[PDB]
C-alpha cells in the first residue's frame, strides 16, 4: 500500500519570554 | 494466477514537532 | 490434455510505509 | 505532522524603576 496519512499537527511551543520592565 | 492487490495504506505518520515559543 | 487455467489472484500486498510527521 | 500552535504569550515583565525624587 501507499504511505499512510499525515500524523497529528504538534504539541504547541512553550510559554513565550517575559516582557519589558 | 496475476499478483494480489495492494496491500492496505500504511499507518499515518508521527506527531509533529513543538510549535514556536 | 492442455494446460490447466490460471491459478487464483495472489493474496494482497503488505501494509504501506508510515506516513509523514 | 505539522508543528504544533505557538506556545503561550510569556509573562509580565518587572516592576519598573523607583520615580523621581
Same mark, same amino acid.
Given at each position: @500500500? $501507499?504511505? @499512510? $496519512?499525515? /500524523? =497529528?499537527?504538534? $504539541?504547541? /511551543? %512553550?510559554? /513565550?519570554?517575559? /516582557? =519589558? %520592565?
Amino acid at each position: @500500500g $501507499p504511505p @499512510g $496519512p499525515p /500524523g =497529528p499537527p504538534g $504539541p504547541p /511551543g %512553550p510559554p /513565550g519570554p517575559p /516582557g =519589558p %520592565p
